[PDB]
Amino acid sequence: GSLPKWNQPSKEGKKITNLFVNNSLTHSKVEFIPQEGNKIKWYACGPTVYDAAHLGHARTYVSFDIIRRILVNYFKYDVFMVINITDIDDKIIKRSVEEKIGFTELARKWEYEFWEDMKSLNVLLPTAITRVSEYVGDIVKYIEKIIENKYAYVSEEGSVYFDIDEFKKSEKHFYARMEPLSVKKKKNAYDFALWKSSKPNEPHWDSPWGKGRPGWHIECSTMASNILGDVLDIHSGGIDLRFPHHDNELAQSEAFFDHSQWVNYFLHSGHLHIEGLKMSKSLKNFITIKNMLTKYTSNQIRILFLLNKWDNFMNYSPNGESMVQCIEIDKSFTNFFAIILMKIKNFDLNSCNLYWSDADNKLNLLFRQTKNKIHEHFLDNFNTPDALLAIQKLITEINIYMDKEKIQIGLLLEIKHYINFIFDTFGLIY
Amino acid sequence: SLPKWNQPSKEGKKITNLFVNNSLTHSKVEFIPQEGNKIKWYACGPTVYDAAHLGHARTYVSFDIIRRILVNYFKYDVFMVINITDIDDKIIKRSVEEKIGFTELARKWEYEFWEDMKSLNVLLPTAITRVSEYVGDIVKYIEKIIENKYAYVSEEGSVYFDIDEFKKSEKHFYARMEPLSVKKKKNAYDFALWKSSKPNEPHWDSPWGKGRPGWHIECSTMASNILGDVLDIHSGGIDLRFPHHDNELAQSEAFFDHSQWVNYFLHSGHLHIEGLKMSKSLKNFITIKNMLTKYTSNQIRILFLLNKWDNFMNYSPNGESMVQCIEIDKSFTNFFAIILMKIKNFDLNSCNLYWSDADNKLNLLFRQTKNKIHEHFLDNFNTPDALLAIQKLITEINIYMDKEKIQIGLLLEIKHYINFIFDTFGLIY
Numbered sequence: 001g002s003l004p005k006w007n008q009p010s011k012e013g014k015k016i017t018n019l020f021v022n023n024s025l026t027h028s029k030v031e032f033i034p035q036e037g038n039k040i041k042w043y044a045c046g047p048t049v050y051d052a053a054h055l056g057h058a059r060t061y062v063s064f065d066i067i068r069r070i071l072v073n074y075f076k077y078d079v080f081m082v083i084n085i086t087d088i089d090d091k092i093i094k095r096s097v098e099e100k101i102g103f104t105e106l107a108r109k110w111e112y113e114f115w116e117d118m119k120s121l122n123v124l125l126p127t128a129i130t131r132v133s134e135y136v137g138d139i140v141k142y143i144e145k146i147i148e149n150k151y152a153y154v155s156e157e158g159s160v161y162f163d164i165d166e167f168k169k170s171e172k173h174f175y176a177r178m179e180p181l182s183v184k185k186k187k188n189a190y191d192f193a194l195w196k197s198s199k200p201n202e203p204h205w206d207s208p209w210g211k212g213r214p215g216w217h218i219e220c221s222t223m224a225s226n227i228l229g230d231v232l233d234i235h236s237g238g239i240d241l242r243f244p245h246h247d248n249e250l251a252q253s254e255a256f257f258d259h260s261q262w263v264n265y266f267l268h269s270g271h272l273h274i275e276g277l278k279m280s281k282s283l284k285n286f287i288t289i290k291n292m293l294t295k296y297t298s299n300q301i302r303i304l305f306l307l308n309k310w311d312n313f314m315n316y317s318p319n320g321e322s323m324v325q326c327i328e329i330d331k332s333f334t335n336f337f338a339i340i341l342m343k344i345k346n347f348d349l350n351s352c353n354l355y356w357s358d359a360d361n362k363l364n365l366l367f368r369q370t371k372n373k374i375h376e377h378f379l380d381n382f383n384t385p386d387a388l389l390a391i392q393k394l395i396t397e398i399n400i401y402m403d404k405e406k407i408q409i410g411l412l413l414e415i416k417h418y419i420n421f422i423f424d425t426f427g428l429i430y
Numbered sequence: 431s432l433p434k435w436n437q438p439s440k441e442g443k444k445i446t447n448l449f450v451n452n453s454l455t456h457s458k459v460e461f462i463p464q465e466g467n468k469i470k471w472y473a474c475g476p477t478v479y480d481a482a483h484l485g486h487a488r489t490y491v492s493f494d495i496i497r498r499i500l501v502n503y504f505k506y507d508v509f510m511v512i513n514i515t516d517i518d519d520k521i522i523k524r525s526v527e528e529k530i531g532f533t534e535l536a537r538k539w540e541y542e543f544w545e546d547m548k549s550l551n552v553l554l555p556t557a558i559t560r561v562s563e564y565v566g567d568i569v570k571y572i573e574k575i576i577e578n579k580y581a582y583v584s585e586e587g588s589v590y591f592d593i594d595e596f597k598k599s600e601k602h603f604y605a606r607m608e609p610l611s612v613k614k615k616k617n618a619y620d621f622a623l624w625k626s627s628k629p630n631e632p633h634w635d636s637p638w639g640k641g642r643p644g645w646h647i648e649c650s651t652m653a654s655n656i657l658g659d660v661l662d663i664h665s666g667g668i669d670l671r672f673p674h675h676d677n678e679l680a681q682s683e684a685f686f687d688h689s690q691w692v693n694y695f696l697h698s699g700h701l702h703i704e705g706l707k708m709s710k711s712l713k714n715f716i717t718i719k720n721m722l723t724k725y726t727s728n729q730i731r732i733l734f735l736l737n738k739w740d741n742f743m744n745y746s747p748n749g750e751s752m753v754q755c756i757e758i759d760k761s762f763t764n765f766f767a768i769i770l771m772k773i774k775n776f777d778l779n780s781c782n783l784y785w786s787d788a789d790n791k792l793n794l795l796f797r798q799t800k801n802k803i804h805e806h807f808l809d810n811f812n813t814p815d816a817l818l819a820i821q822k823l824i825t826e827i828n829i830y831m832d833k834e835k836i837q838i839g840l841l842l843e844i845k846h847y848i849n850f851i852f853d854t855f856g857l858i859y
């Protein structure tokens with residue numbers, strides 16, 4: 001009917017938190033319902049490992065790390081996550097001849113440094129790490145099934161292409177669900193390659209159609225489908241990937257399983273722009289995660305991303321201009337934990353009075369209110385900027401209470417623990 | 431002819447389908463908060479005249495576990511109050527035998543009690559309410575009970591709860607939880623709200639004369655001032671259910687003139703040593719400090735994790751009961767040793783990360799165990815079965831790490847989940 005349709009999961013038997021997430025399939029905020037129980041099957045597109053990672057990559061993976069911590073630590077969902085490592089790619093192939101070291105040896109180098117940068121930022125590793133080099137055989141069988149479903153064709157040179165026209169014809173299949181308006185050997189220019197016949201002096205793999213490499217998009221559909229299956233609760237990535245990469249993943253997986261909805265919720269992180277231009281290796285405006293870590297700490301970098309809503313675009317000001325606010329917040333969190341611990345330590349039950357005073361009750365009321373504010377923020381599509389503000393306000397009032405008033409030791413311990421619980425959800429470490 | 435219980439409405443509340451053994455209904459009922467996800471919780475505290483023993487440990491560690499389940503696992507919001515009974519006949523007697531002040535004795539054993547609690551990793555409550563600091567509030571509480579014509583004053587200057595006037599009212603039933611357990615008095619079963627003090631005994635000025643608060647009035651006063659007319663949870667040991675807890679309900683119902691002061695009354699079962707309750711008087715008791723020179727806090731918490739909070743349990747001394755606990759503590763320790771070392775020393779550069787069938791089978795048992803434990807916690811805090819679920823999962827993880835090629839991310843997830851459950855249990859590794 002010229003409009004793509006979206007089927008919300010049924011609510012019976014599912015964990016309902018009334019969480020709302022910005023879903024790129026509906027281009028709106030919708031209630032999140034698991035496919036099965038409280039389980040969330042989640043695939044996230046990974047890096048292409050030919051170079052150092054930069055602050056833009058940090059934005060995406062730290063942002064979805066925070067969302068993952070919110071889902072699992074805060075809401076107690078059960079998340080099964082997969083991230084691919086794209087270790088075969090044209091950029092890796094070209095760089096390996098420039099570097100005069102093996103392609104595989106170059107790919108491990110930058111995958112290792114990528115995971116070390118993620119660990120440095122306190123990013124949790126996914127459940128499964130799926131490398132393209134280890135899945136080429138699975139990829140080929142995936143392409144075969146797409147061909148048997150008559151949604152792909154083979155060129156004489158030995159490449160394989162996705163037949164978009166055959167895909168559209170089916171009433172159950174719509175091409176480019178998320179960006180409908182973004183649309184030689186080929187039937188049509190809009191067809192894309194699943195298998196590429198191998199260029200000379202290029203790494204290659206055996207296949208029924210000839211020596212070749214996987215195409216850009218087939219890696220993700222194959223790996224995600226083998227481990228997670230015919231329905232994905234969440235698929236994530238940066239916004240630039242929405243078309244053509246993610247829409248093509250949907251086309252390949254729908255073609256493979258012959259069904260209409262491979263993914264219930266598609267989440268796209270907004271881009272990090274430096275001076276109004278996206279941070280890209282090509283532009284030469286980029287800042288490596290390692291350089292960033294020599295001036296600033298993991299907490300400060302995470303606070304930078306906490307201050308910017310995950311699905312919005314953000315602008316980083318270099319020379320620490322944007323980092324000035326972050327350093328202030330990290331400095332005050334550190335000082336807070338210092339004080340409240342000294343006051344808990346020096347508290348003496350025998351000499352203090354433990355009457356529940358009016359000052360105590362006022363702080364307690366603010367403490368329970370702040371718990372409910374933060375809960376609404378997380379339900380409001382992971383509004384970490386406002387949740388972080390709630391904690392700062394609560395800390396300002398705790399500082400006043402501790403300085404003057406007589407302190408209820410138990411109340412202060414409870415508040416320290418809640419703030420610890422929220423900071424663990426953020427990935428901050430104090 | 432039987433008291434009725436009104437379940438809170440589910441509308442607007444956090445509903446977990448949790449079921450708790452409620453002494454008011456003498457059955458298992460679904461737990462519904464009074465307001466949203468908030469739980470107002472009052473727990474009867476110790477009388478600070480002596481060292482705490484393993485029985486006190488059973489009650490407070492068991493309800494610490496329940497509190498951790500409620501807050502850490504289910505993400506409820508718990509506002510808790512515990513009284514310290516620092517004025518009491520037992521404190522007065524002990525203070526004269528030792529020839530020390532009533533307050534100096536109470537502070538000493540209050541301090542050792544909180545130190546014993548910290549040693550067992552028992553979380554402190556939000557508010558600690560001492561009777562000596564609330565004597566004025568207690569008096570004003572008794573006044574309102576008298577104005578509602580549910581209490582009367584004797585010639586000596588004492589005040590007594592008029593049970594018969596309380597029963598007459600249709601909105602009030604006396605002794606809801608133990609209905610069959612029922613001189614100056616109108617009736618012998620009336621109990622004192624205010625006791626006229628002998629001149630030597632410590633006392634406080636009051637409208638009816640110098641006196642002390644009675645046994646039960648302290649708790650109704652303090653819980654009502656901080657938490658109010660409705661208590662989501664009131665907890666204590668089983669022997670306290672009558673007359674102490676039933677009298678708390680009568681006093682609070684009389685004060686507020688309503689029918690239900692507490693939605694859910696949870697009573698931990700008693701710890702018996704050689705078939706008799708651990709009591710200072712019997713001389714069968716084991717202090718928490720003595721216990722901690724023989725066994726560790728984790729081992730002691732595992733003992734109470736193995737015994738369901740609301741059931742009676744028998745401790746066999748000379749380490750008979752503790753042998754099982756020490757084995758479990760040993761196996762948790764060794765499991766964490768391996769999984770932590772393999773996570774640290776895992777090297778992404780040299781490893782193969784294909785999602786193998788062994789990886790998929792461990793993952794399936796891992797998610798299955800999450801659902802088993804979830805059902806156990808909903809089943810009235812069945813920590814013994816949740817603990818067994820963890821043990822089963824740990825046996826299979828040990829095999830996986832020893833033999834299979836390990837998915838570093840999957841092992842991190844399992845390490846994180848088991849830590850999350852151990853924090854809910856209060857274990858520290």
Ligand SMILES: Nc1nc2c(ncn2[C@@H]2O[C@H](COP(=O)(O)O)[C@@H](O)[C@H]2O)c(=O)[nH]1
Pocket residue numbers: 001002167168169173174175176180181183
């Ligand atoms: N990307 C995409 N565009 C489609 C599809 N079907 C129709 N359209 C677009 O929608 C317009 C309406 O044509 P119809 O929907 O009747 O085929 C066409 O001009 C075509 O560009 C489809 O499956 N995928």
Ligand SMILES: Nc1nc2c(ncn2[C@@H]2O[C@H](COP(=O)(O)O)[C@@H](O)[C@H]2O)c(=O)[nH]1
Pocket residue numbers: 045046047048049055056057059060236237238239240241269270271272273278279280
């Ligand atoms: N936020 C943000 N994400 C980026 C940027 N550049 C790449 N990404 C994201 O980082 C992930 C991996 O990056 P890749 O290595 O594919 O360039 C992708 O999901 C992509 O969307 C950037 O400048 N900002």
Ligand SMILES: Nc1nc2c(ncn2[C@@H]2O[C@H](COP(=O)(O)O)[C@@H](O)[C@H]2O)c(=O)[nH]1
Pocket residue numbers: 596597598602603604605609610612
């Ligand atoms: N425990 C208890 N028993 C009551 C109450 N009201 C009446 N009863 C019992 O019910 C029986 C019937 O007496 P009535 O209900 O006429 O007072 C009495 O023998 C009395 O024991 C009450 O509030 N509490």
Ligand SMILES: Nc1nc2c(ncn2[C@@H]2O[C@H](COP(=O)(O)O)[C@@H](O)[C@H]2O)c(=O)[nH]1
Pocket residue numbers: 474475476477478484485486488489666667668669670698699700701702707708709
């Ligand atoms: N499980 C258990 N609890 C006890 C024992 N003795 C006292 N308690 C509990 O410990 C708490 C404080 O005891 P108290 O200081 O009032 O003697 C009360 O809630 C009481 O129920 C015992 O032998 N076993």
Ligand code: NA
Pocket residue numbers: 239240241242243244
């Ligand atoms: Na794009």
Ligand code: NA
Pocket residue numbers: 668669670671672673
């Ligand atoms: Na009793």
Ligand SMILES: [Zn+2]
Pocket residue numbers: 044045046220245
């Ligand atoms: Zn991808």
Ligand SMILES: [Zn+2]
Pocket residue numbers: 473474475649674
């Ligand atoms: Zn009490």
